[PDB]
Enzyme design. Sequence first.
Site, PDB file in Angstrom:
ATOM      1  N   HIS A 113       0.781  -1.012   0.143  1.00  0.00           N
ATOM      2  CA  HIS A 113       0.049  -0.098  -0.032  1.00  0.00           C
ATOM      3  C   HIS A 113       0.891   1.188  -0.040  1.00  0.00           C
ATOM      4  CE1 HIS A 113      -3.431   2.667   1.193  1.00  0.00           C
ATOM      5  NE2 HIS A 113      -2.639   3.338   1.842  1.00  0.00           N
ATOM      6  N   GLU A 114       1.753   1.318   0.819  1.00  0.00           N
ATOM      7  CA  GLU A 114       2.973   2.383   0.854  1.00  0.00           C
ATOM      8  C   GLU A 114       3.636   2.728  -0.517  1.00  0.00           C
ATOM      9  OE1 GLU A 114       1.198   2.830   4.371  1.00  0.00           O
ATOM     10  OE2 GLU A 114       2.634   4.331   3.303  1.00  0.00           O
ATOM     11  N   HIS A 117       1.663   4.944  -2.742  1.00  0.00           N
ATOM     12  CA  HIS A 117       2.024   6.311  -2.394  1.00  0.00           C
ATOM     13  C   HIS A 117       3.285   6.763  -2.996  1.00  0.00           C
ATOM     14  CE1 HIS A 117      -1.851   7.018   0.260  1.00  0.00           C
ATOM     15  NE2 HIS A 117      -1.199   5.868   0.962  1.00  0.00           N
ATOM     16  N   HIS A 123      -5.457   7.701  -2.756  1.00  0.00           N
ATOM     17  CA  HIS A 123      -6.300   6.731  -1.986  1.00  0.00           C
ATOM     18  C   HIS A 123      -7.457   6.513  -3.012  1.00  0.00           C
ATOM     19  CE1 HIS A 123      -4.666   7.399   2.150  1.00  0.00           C
ATOM     20  NE2 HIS A 123      -4.404   6.086   1.666  1.00  0.00           N
TER      21      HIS A 123
HETATM   22  O1  BBT Z   1      -4.513   4.563   4.677  1.00  0.00           O
HETATM   23  C1  BBT Z   1      -3.291   4.612   5.219  1.00  0.00           C
HETATM   24  N1  BBT Z   1      -2.430   5.119   4.268  1.00  0.00           N
HETATM   25  C2  BBT Z   1      -1.183   5.184   4.667  1.00  0.00           C
HETATM   26  O2  BBT Z   1      -0.214   5.713   4.061  1.00  0.00           O
HETATM   27  N2  BBT Z   1      -0.675   4.883   5.989  1.00  0.00           N
HETATM   28  C3  BBT Z   1      -1.535   4.016   6.923  1.00  0.00           C
HETATM   29  O3  BBT Z   1      -1.323   3.818   7.961  1.00  0.00           O
HETATM   30  C4  BBT Z   1      -2.935   3.778   6.243  1.00  0.00           C
HETATM   31  C5  BBT Z   1      -2.873   2.315   5.663  1.00  0.00           C
HETATM   32  C6  BBT Z   1      -3.937   1.684   4.944  1.00  0.00           C
HETATM   33  C7  BBT Z   1      -3.860   0.368   4.422  1.00  0.00           C
HETATM   34  C8  BBT Z   1      -2.690  -0.262   4.272  1.00  0.00           C
HETATM   35  C9  BBT Z   1      -1.664   0.318   5.132  1.00  0.00           C
HETATM   36  C10 BBT Z   1      -1.699   1.514   5.677  1.00  0.00           C
HETATM   37  N3  BBT Z   1      -3.980   3.546   7.290  1.00  0.00           N
HETATM   38  C11 BBT Z   1      -4.102   2.521   8.000  1.00  0.00           C
HETATM   39  C12 BBT Z   1      -5.321   2.329   8.801  1.00  0.00           C
HETATM   40  C13 BBT Z   1      -5.771   3.571   9.508  1.00  0.00           C
HETATM   41  C14 BBT Z   1      -7.234   3.183  10.113  1.00  0.00           C
HETATM   42  C15 BBT Z   1      -7.366   4.161  11.282  1.00  0.00           C
HETATM   43  O4  BBT Z   1      -8.406   3.693  11.831  1.00  0.00           O
HETATM   44  C16 BBT Z   1      -5.698   4.748   8.680  1.00  0.00           C
HETATM   45  C17 BBT Z   1      -4.377   5.029   7.702  1.00  0.00           C
HETATM   46 ZN    ZN Z   2      -2.467   5.276   2.349  1.00  0.00          ZN
END
Ligand code: BBT
Ligand code: ZN
Length: 158
Positions: A113-114, A117, A123
């Site tokens: 996922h990172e 980005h 997103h």
């Molecule tokens: O969406 C995200 N995006 C990121 O870049 N980093 C995160 O940690 C992220 C993420 C999402 C998916 C995978 C990895 C990271 N995410 C994790 C879950 C969190 C939920 C809070 O309730 C919201 C931010």
């Molecule tokens: Zn993200």
Amino acid sequence: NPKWERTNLTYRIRNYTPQLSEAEVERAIKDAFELWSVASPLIFTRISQGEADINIAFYQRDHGDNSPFDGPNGILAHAFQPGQGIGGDAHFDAEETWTNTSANYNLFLVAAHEFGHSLGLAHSSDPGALMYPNYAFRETSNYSLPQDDIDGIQAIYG
Ligand SMILES: O=C1N=C(O)NC(=O)[C@@]1(c1ccccc1)N1CCC(CCO)CC1
Ligand SMILES: [Zn+2]
Ligand SMILES: [Ca+2]
Ligand SMILES: [Ca+2]
Ligand SMILES: [Zn+2]
């Protein structure tokens, strides 16, 4: 639309998390980059010395970038949009339990996922997309980039 102007990029794993073996961390990262590689003309090369386009590291709280981590849970990691220096870099919260199983939190999934980005993807609103703003475990064996994400990098790099 910040994007890499080059297709072969380098990455460097700056530190590791005690939670997993070095090989495990390296395997997770390698697999995570491969997801994106098979759907675009992007080629990722791992380096151990010098400056890399994408620096990967595990940090705790304040780590020199205006976005300190919050400890266990909450935000898991963060990456910078394509660019020079800090751009493209990805930081993982060192205080999280990092795994290579279904237990929170799977490193391969968070890393994949990172890197989206790091590649310039925003997103997605599709709950089944890797780029959806929420973490949810999905079978990692032979896992492949969902439909929406393929459309995503495609829209940027072809
Ligand atoms: O969406 C995200 N995006 C990121 O870049 N980093 C995160 O940690 C992220 C993420 C999402 C998916 C995978 C990895 C990271 N995410 C994790 C879950 C969190 C939920 C809070 O309730 C919201 C931010
Ligand atoms: Zn993200
Ligand atoms: Ca956290
Ligand atoms: Ca960088
Ligand atoms: Zn950071």
